[PDB]
């Protein structure tokens, strides 16, 4: 039994995160636990303060018409819990439910682990005989609790995009609001834990340039290679899967390339040394001791700018 | 209390994906979150616009007969949410529920990671005293939302196969519709991440052909073999299990074969060298330097065509 | 209010798999999704075709007495969905529910991966004041849909054991039916993927018999041993846990034993060589080159016959 | 509306395992699927066989008072299914529900994998105006079905501790029964699969005592060490986490200790050999060949007795 | 229909843990299973002992007004089970529900594995027309059962912070109580299992200082490095992820640094030895034999005090 007038029905909305948690780099989901507040005018139940004697009349949710507001990108849907319904005398209604759901918002890993992310929660509502339109009420949207935390993330802002995106769908108007939680990573623990050790084992491979022992050099470059892969296995947990070209793992790919040309160089210095041209081998080796770090530092700089300064 | 006439009851159907997600290579399932729209004529509740005054009369789902449409291939069944029921005056009914479920559609991994897939969602309905037949209404079947994404997949099309497959079952006619979501993989991130490093460590093994040091050669070919398996462990996540003959992993099997014959060759060049026939050893080695890459490039071509050009 | 007569109540039963899936080697469970059909005579609701005018009278499940048929070996119990209830005029009732559950059927891994399995679904019903007995109706038991698949299994048959096992339990008769789904594995993908590479790395270890270099030989046999264990880690997923003596893994245990005696032999050839008896060392080595493969092929044959030909 | 008399209300109880499954060494839980039978006198509904004509009067659970029996150590609580309620003429009531839950019973891993375990299921009931006391009825407690199995365990007994533990709690008496399922492990598959290979790779390390090659010896002892850790990773699944001092893993710790002193000995024999005291090196080596196995066999015996014979 | 008077409504509260379990270092959650007791005055249902004849009048929860107490930091919300409602004659009500939930309390890993933790459970209640305030009743808050256990933790205390934190929220007063479970780890099993073996493999690397064999030394330091990473993979389960600077893993980072400078030193002693300055190499080596352990023991002491003595 929807409210009736010549105007489209506006429904004021407001999310308020009590807790957010379980960001899931793999499923691209994150759980949330929040208030939802709806508010809309219904003159059919507008009432008299004086004859009834009360400032506000509460109602059970079964009793009166309530718009079908729905989340769009939510798996584990319909976890709801009505907390309050308060009808104002002029017929404005104030609905307030607690809810929680696992939202599905895609993440972009290209600048990992310096990425920022912007999680989304959509709300549609579908029209009936009246057209229906949602819109954000900022006093009740200010959705961060001070206590919200994503471990390993700094939480920038929770705000709504004030203009609803109205559109046709299966022969009805539908109105969709977009709430956005913005976050950025706590990278620094990764410097001690991921980048530095990989670099150390790479440098250990570069030691081979001061050796002429082909036996010591294969044992060097190849044993550091095994160490490299084993270490990559060790941190496999902090290197989430993407079908796209990540920053980390561009530099990883580049590191495997350095293992390969280190092996090429070692093999060359040895073939050269056995073809009785020791001067060329010692020159290629003495050269590599400068060449390898430098092309690395350069390729690292190109690569950083390509992802960040671009 | 089903509607009655001399004709079989046609029920118009339409799926509309709001979100699809959680494709699961292991369980061969994927979650979906969509509209379902059913529509069918029931003259028993056909009514008068003039005497009742309204263009359309909505009903609670308990109130009137509703066909038992059911998904066939769905674990985590019965996640339903009625959104709209609108009865036209001629007795046509328009049902619209939001639902989500994890569909069970088998995947074919033979051309991984260049595979395309075609996910399926079936709908049966079972006959009563009236025969019953489902059929697809394209205006409400156009099921892709623009926002649907399978991370790492390009989503080609969501369409329904318009002819229902009617058939006897436990002494009743049953009618089954087939909706099909079509997808194809985002392979390219795999070239930097999977294929190139395996190739580099294999080439490092081929370095042994320029060495005559049996000590350096065992250390070479066998340490690169350990590196190879360790790397395979590293990418174990991106190589899903099949009971059948995959393209990748045909080439992987072939790589293990190349490690084996490299070891055979190394051992031969060394036994030959100790039997005082150094010319045969250096000829077998100098030969291997061309033979190995070439049979590889050839075997790779045969293998590519066998899977793709066949 | 159970039906009454001087006879024990027979209830005709019939399972019909629509889908089976998620065979779980670890939990020894598998999910299923099927029809259940019950059928039994109740003269109390037998009725007149002529005075009532209809061939069959349908009933809501709340309305009439329905036997408590129950699955025995089912975790995630009670996922039910009544589809049809049709009462015949003589009082026979035809019940038909769709259901799904995860069945608990033990698997036997001794001949893995050439094993066949025979999954079980039990049905008990418990007596009241009337004795009660289940029995299988083959027209509705023919439970395979053509579309059922267990990925990596060929599905032989779905049949029921026609004689119920009646027995006393907590002072009541109980009757239990046994339905059996029979399957056999798709082994062949395992030959390229598991057996051949293990064999290659073992043969690489046998290469040591053509070397006299103790340095090269320890590096050989022990680096192939590390490769072995790393490879075992790689295929750890396809080697399910058992508390019993599996075929695969008998041969695996035997492979570790071959690494051990290869190390013993290498060490012996070297101690012999340093005790200035080179003729014994070269004889033991030249002997091993035949002895190792042959005792392997023999032990493999004994072992195959012990598990298969026994 | 509880039954009233001058006596405390005794409630006879009885669990009957239909299936037990999913023992979880990690969460320290195990799933169960059983009957529960309650029985208690209620003269308020005692009735006349002659005037009513029936030997037993069944009731719907809503209709009559039923004690709040509750499991204590259960996550995934309240999975219930009433099967029977039968009231005797003198007012004794016989309740029977099927249920399943995941019970939380701590495991003790100190003698793994020769451990036995004793799983617990508690039942409290809380007092009202009448005091209330549970007590076990053995005819309906005999809870094993013949078909119960924990894969890899032998199931000794399912019995109840007949004396309830009554106690004050939040100003009411509460009565708690303790049912106990007793089990012991199937260790033997572990001898081929875990213990023997670790021992083989350790013995391979001991081979170094017959070599004087410091190059061969480091390659030996350290490559077997890497093999060891890799093997430990391989069986990581069968070595469950404890915050306490396990038997296995005492012996593992001891094995790492043997790797360490083998390295110490090897380094010593080599420093001695370069300080031109070859006699002391060859004596320390020739000594180690007996010392290492023996201190091992001894330490293994001490360690076995400390855990088992103590 | 809330109780009315000129005063704010105080609601006495009390949690009582029956079981706590499944502490989850990864999700930073832990499950709990407890009593909740609410108590508050409602004169509207105050009653006469004499005219009604009973000391206490029990009520069904539907029948009377009950405050909306709610947990704040709880995923898997609303697992409730009313156990008792007892109204005193003066109108005080005594509510008692059993519940269980997975609480979300952040953990601090900086002093792992010597950390203590302090888990939190919050309770808000929201005001209506009356202001509403929660407060803790210690006789029913004494929440530890003697049987509570977190495996691997010693459980210090379960207490409540007696002063509620009242505050404005969405135009209502809200009152929030804070219950705190305090725990501290069982570290000692980690000394045999994690710290000692890492130290052993590190010391094995330090053996290289008594060798001048560059072949033996690369094989030494680098093979121990691989061993190190493999071992880190073995204990990866007991080293939970943090975005911050942990104590363990500061020492791990420092260990990787020692591998790196051991490689540097080895390479230097070898380049020095080939530049025909053997005295500098043997001095740097003989120096390292004291320098490495000592800077380690010092760095370990600095690092211990920085985390613990600071
Ligand atoms: Cl050399
Ligand atoms: Cl050589
Ligand atoms: Cl040698
Ligand atoms: Cl030596
Ligand atoms: Cl050297
Ligand atoms: Na890992
Ligand atoms: Na993996
Ligand atoms: Na694995
Ligand atoms: Na593992
Ligand atoms: Na691991």
Swiss-Prot record, chains A, B, C, D, E:
Outcome when changing residue 215 to Q/D: Decreases binding affinity of TBA
A GO molecular-function annotation: potassium channel activity
Coiled-coil blocks: none
Inhibition and activation profile: Tetraethylammonium (TEA) and tetrabutylammonium (TBA) inhibit the proton-activated currents in a dose- and voltage-dependent manner in vitro, whereas the blocker of acid sensing ion channels, amiloride, has no effect. Channel current of GLIC can be inhibited by inhaled and intravenous general anesthetics at and below concentrations used clinically. Ion conduction is also inhibited by lidocaine and by divalent transition metal ions such as cadmium ions.
Alphabetical UniProt keywords: Cell inner membrane, Cell membrane, Ion channel, Ion transport, Ligand-gated ion channel, Membrane, Potassium, Potassium channel, Potassium transport, Receptor, Signal, Sodium, Sodium channel, Sodium transport, Transmembrane, Transmembrane helix, Transport
SUPFAM superfamilies: Neurotransmitter-gated ion-channel transmembrane pore (SSF90112), Nicotinic receptor ligand binding domain-like (SSF63712)
Membrane-spanning residues: 187-209, 213-237, 246-274, 278-310
Subunit structure: Homopentamer.
Family: Belongs to the ligand-gated ion channel (TC 1.A.9) family.
Protein name: Proton-gated ion channel
Organism of this sequence: Gloeobacter violaceus (strain ATCC 29082 / PCC 7421)
């Amino acid at each position: 039994p929807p409210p009736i007038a010549d105007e489209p029905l506006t429904v004021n909305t407001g999310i308020y995160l009590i807790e957010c948690y379980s960001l899931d780099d793999k499923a691209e989901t994150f759980k949330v636990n929040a208030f939802l507040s709806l508010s809309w005018k219904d003159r059919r139940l507008a009432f008299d303060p004086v004859r009834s004697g009360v400032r506000v009349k509460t109602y059970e949710p079964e009793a009166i018409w309530i718009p079908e507001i729905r989340f769009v990108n939510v798996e584990n849907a319909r976890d709801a819990d009505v907390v309050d319904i308060s009808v104002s005398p002029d017929g404005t209604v104030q609905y307030l439910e607690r809810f929680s759901a696992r939202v599905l918002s895609p993440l972009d890993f290209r600048r990992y682990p310096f990425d920022s992310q912007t999680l989304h929660i959509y709300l549609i509502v579908r029209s009936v005989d009246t057209r229906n339109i949602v819109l954000a009420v900022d006093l009740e949207k200010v959705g961060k609790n001070d206590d919200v935390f994503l471990t390993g993330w700094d939480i920038e802002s929770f705000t709504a995009v004030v203009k609803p995106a109205n559109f046709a769908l299966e022969d009805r108007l539908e109105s969709k609001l977009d709430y956005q939680l913005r976050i950025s990573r706590q990278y620094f623990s990764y410097i001690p834990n991921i980048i530095l050790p990989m670099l150390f084992i790479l440098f250990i491979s570069w030691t081979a340039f001061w050796s002429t022992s082909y036996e010591a050099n294969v044992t060097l470059v190849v044993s550091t290679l095994i160490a490299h892969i084993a270490f990559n296995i060790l941190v496999e947990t902090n290197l989430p899967k993407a079908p796209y070209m990540t920053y980390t793992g561009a530099i990883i790919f580049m590191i495997y390339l350095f293992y390969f040309v280190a092996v090429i160089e070692v093999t060359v210095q040895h073939y050269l040394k056995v073809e009785s041209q020791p001067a060329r081998a010692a020159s290629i080796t003495r050269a590599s001791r400068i060449a390898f770090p430098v092309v690395f530092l350069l390729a690292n700089i190109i690569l950083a700018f390509l992802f960040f300064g671009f």
